[PDB]
Amino acid sequence: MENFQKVEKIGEGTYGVVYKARNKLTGEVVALKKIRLDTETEGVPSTAIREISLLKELNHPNIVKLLDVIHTENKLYLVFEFLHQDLKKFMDASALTGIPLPLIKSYLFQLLQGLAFCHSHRVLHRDLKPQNLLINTEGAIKLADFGLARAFGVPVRTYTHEVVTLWYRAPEILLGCKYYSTAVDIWSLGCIFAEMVTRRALFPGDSEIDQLFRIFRTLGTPDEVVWPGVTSMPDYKPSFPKWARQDFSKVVPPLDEDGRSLLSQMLHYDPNKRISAKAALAHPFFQDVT
Amino acid sequence: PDYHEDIHTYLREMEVKCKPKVGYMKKQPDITNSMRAILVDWLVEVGEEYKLQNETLHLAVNYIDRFLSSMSVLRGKLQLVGTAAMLLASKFEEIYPPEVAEFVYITDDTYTKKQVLRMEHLVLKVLTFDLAAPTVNQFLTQYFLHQQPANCKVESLAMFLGELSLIDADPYLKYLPSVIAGAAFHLALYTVTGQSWPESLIRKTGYTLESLKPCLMDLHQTYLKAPQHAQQSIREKYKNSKYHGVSLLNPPETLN
Ligand SMILES: CC[C@H](CO)Nc1nc(NCc2ccc(O)cc2)c(N=O)c(NC(C)C)n1
Ligand code: NA
Ligand code: NA
């Protein structure tokens, strides 16, 4: 680590600290993810073990590139490529005028390519949100932060329940389904799609119950017809208010028919019928992507 | 469905790459297949004591064989390797991995916490953090989808047979996980229902009964001779009703 100079604190991740840094010999700009091992006394954390192992299996233009892992007796550094901006910050800087529609389509297309690849290599990301999506000056967008990720099986077993940041969390998680899978990632991308178009979070809940009710108010409270088994789910309550589905031209006003159709399929309640990353790429919405 | 085919394709590709060197034990000066078998059988019991998944056990065995493919270990350190491997596999695979102190405890203080953690670092270094390995179990659960409705006895017996293969480096290190799984599933299907390796799986995998035959010949023998094997923890495990007592069922005498 002698050869890296720290330039600035980027932030805190799923664990540890991120720095922008420069290789003092080559000039190469990187992002360093530091993990202090002595302050856990349980060894290398699972978050780190999974991020590293799964990233070495995920080489793709829309997945952030892990360059090296430097493993001291005292510390552990993941060395990644550096990208200059995250999507959350880009949305804030475009908060008035909007992100132009072709760039929103381009970014969604790229995010889906990255995600289809993850799912094709049996990886669930489980923390898709604008803060974890990184953009370079070339117009590329990349999935980042695989610390909450996990390698899944066919078919799936029960996995960790405390997953996905609240605003981006799928209804099958909130309602406590025994099984979840790739669909939870699609839900998150659907929320991100809509957030790019409207310039604000689609479902900004402050609790699990508040989150559910915001989803219900927009999409309609689900019943046995739209989602078989829903009223029997662990955290489903018969007292839940019955709201009617809002017309998608109030939910996402700037979008054409194709856009609205793709969003509705990404936010489909029944995870079995929610569109796949692969099928989403073949949606008519993308026939003119650049 | 979209990506189920792709996952299968991708795992078939990684099982070649995450294979250990077949004859590594010849090149180990102080340790043998017999000591390896003792270690794996002990890991089965650790898995039972901590109610760990079968996938975790299978991943641990992968890690151990890979490590011993490139590193010389004295016999009194072989258990330390196995402990660190089981810890790593637990972190990868489990929702609630046991803590390091519990792992020290099941070695009966043969090692310290410090030793287990330093070995964890060394195993990670030697395997270059490549822990997402295909296992027999990952192929089995896919193969099981091609019997509808699921026969829980077949599934438990197939798992049992796949687990026994972990115990004996000779001959099972020369087969790939997808092949062992295929043999295991045919054998389990045949024992319980009289059915064979289905047409749908010949299409999915590209394996015929005849390509499975050499592994199936070995696995039949291992099954027949299981009650007399020196290692017995797997047989004991699979007596429980959780696994429909399938280790008590009589192996077929011939396969035709
Ligand atoms: C806060 C942690 C996240 C990681 O999801 N932010 C982030 N931002 C990154 N860049 C956007 C950014 C750049 C400069 C800043 O001052 C702030 C954000 C970034 N660069 O690659 C990066 N790299 C990870 C792969 C470790 N991580
Ligand atoms: Na719906
Ligand atoms: Na030897």
The 3-class secondary structure across A139-158, one letter per residue, is CCEEECCCCCCEECCCCCCC
Residue A82, ligand 1, Cβ within 6 A: yes
Closest Cα partner for A277 from A61, A103, A113? A113
Residue B174 is classified by DSSP as T
In this structure, how many other beta carbons lie within 10 angstroms of the beta carbon of residue B255? 15
Q: Write the CB contacts of B238 (distance below 8 Å, at least 6 apart in sequence).
A: B156, B159, B160, B163, B245, B246, B247
In this structure, how many other beta carbons lie within 10 angstroms of the beta carbon of residue B66? 22
Residue A275, both tokens: 């569109």
Q: How many whole angstroms separate alpha carbon A68 and alpha carbon A78?
A: 6
Rg (CA), chain B: 18
> What is residue A80's three-state secondary structure?
strand
Q: How many whole angstroms separate alpha carbon B77 and alpha carbon B20?
A: 20
Residue A64, ligand 1, Cβ within 6 A: yes
Q: How many whole angstroms separate alpha carbon A149 and alpha carbon A147?
A: 5
Closest residue in B to A70 (Cα) is B125
Using N-to-C axis directions, what is the helix angle for A183-198 and A257-266, rounded to 10°?
140
Q: Which helix (H) or strand (E) holds A4?
A: strand A4-12
Phi, psi (deg, nearest 5) at residue B252: -60, 150
Out of A10, A88, A132, give the residue to mutate to test ligand 1, the one with the largest number of ligand atoms within 8 Å of its CB. A10
Do the beta carbons of residue B49 and residue B4 sit within 8 Å? no
Buried b (16+ CB within 10 A) or exposed e, B129-153: bbbbbbbbbbbbbbbbebbeeebeb
Residue B77 is classified by DSSP as G
Residue A167 is classified by DSSP as G
Residue A85, ligand 1, Cβ within 6 A: yes
Residue B155, both tokens: 């599934």
Residue A13, both tokens: 């991740």
Residue A13, ligand 1, Cβ within 6 A: yes
- Domain borders along chain B are 6-19+133-256, 20-132
> What is residue A112's three-state secondary structure?
helix
Do the beta carbons of residue A146 and residue A241 sit within 8 Å? no
Place of tokens 């489980």: A126
**Which of B115, B129, B204, B205 has the most A C-beta neighbours within 10 Å, making it the best mutation to test the interface with A?**
B129
**Residues A38, A68, A92, A127: which is the catalytic one?**
A127
Considering only CB atoms, which residues of chain B are within 8 Å of chain A? Answer: 2-4, 6-8, 10-11, 14, 53, 55, 87-88, 91-92, 95, 97, 99-100, 116-117, 120-121, 124-125, 128-132, 138, 141-142, 145
Cβ within 8 Å, pair B100-A159? no
Cis preceding-peptide flag for B149 (omega within 30 of 0): yes
Rg (CA), chain A: 20
Do the beta carbons of residue A131 and residue A148 sit within 8 Å? no
Which CATH number does A85-287 carry?
A: 1.10.510.10
In order, the DSSP letters of A5-51 are EEEEEEEE-SSSEEEEEEETTT--EEEEEEEESTTT-SSS-HHHHHH
Phi, psi (deg, nearest 5) at residue B98: -65, 155
> What is residue A97's three-state secondary structure?
coil
Q: How many whole angstroms separate alpha carbon B175 and alpha carbon B181?
A: 10
Do the beta carbons of residue B184 and residue B162 sit within 8 Å? yes
In order, the DSSP letters of A210-247 are HHHHHHHHHH----TTTSTTGGGSTT--TTS--PPPPP
Ion ligand 2 residues within 5 Å by Cβ:
A 226, 268-269
Widest CA span in chain A: 64
Closest residue in B to A46 (Cα) is B91
Annotation says A247 is catalytic: no
- Delimiting residues of CATH 3.30.200.20 domain(s) in chain A: 8-81
Return the amino acid letter for A178: K
Q: How many whole angstroms separate alpha carbon A223 and alpha carbon B19?
A: 49
End-to-end CA distance of chain B: 35
Q: How many whole angstroms separate alpha carbon A254 and alpha carbon A273?
A: 26
Ligand 3 center–CA B116 separation, angstroms:
24
In this structure, how many other beta carbons lie within 10 angstroms of the beta carbon of residue B253? 7
> What is residue A85's three-state secondary structure?
strand
Q: How many whole angstroms separate alpha carbon A235 and alpha carbon A241?
A: 14
Q: Write the CB contacts of B215 (distance below 8 Å, at least 6 apart in sequence).
A: B175, B179, B180, B182, B183
CA distances in angstroms from A146 to A105, A191, B188, B246, listed in the order given: 24, 19, 38, 39
Place of tokens 């078998």: B37
Calculate the CA B219 to chain-centre distance: 13
Ligand 1 atom nearest residue A32's Cα: 26
Domain A8-81 has CATH 3.30.200.20: yes
Place of tokens 């045949």: B190
In this structure, how many other beta carbons lie within 10 angstroms of the beta carbon of residue A65? 15
3-state percent breakdown (helix, strand, coil) of chain B, nearest 5: 65, 0, 35
Place of tokens 């099981």: B144
- Delimiting residues of CATH 1.10.510.10 domain(s) in chain A: 85-287
Chain B partners within 8 Å of A180 (Cβ): none
Burial of A2 (0-12, 13-18, 19+ CB in 10 A): exposed
Q: How many contacts (CB atoms, under 8 Å) link A and B?
A: 82
Do the beta carbons of residue B245 and residue B153 sit within 8 Å? no
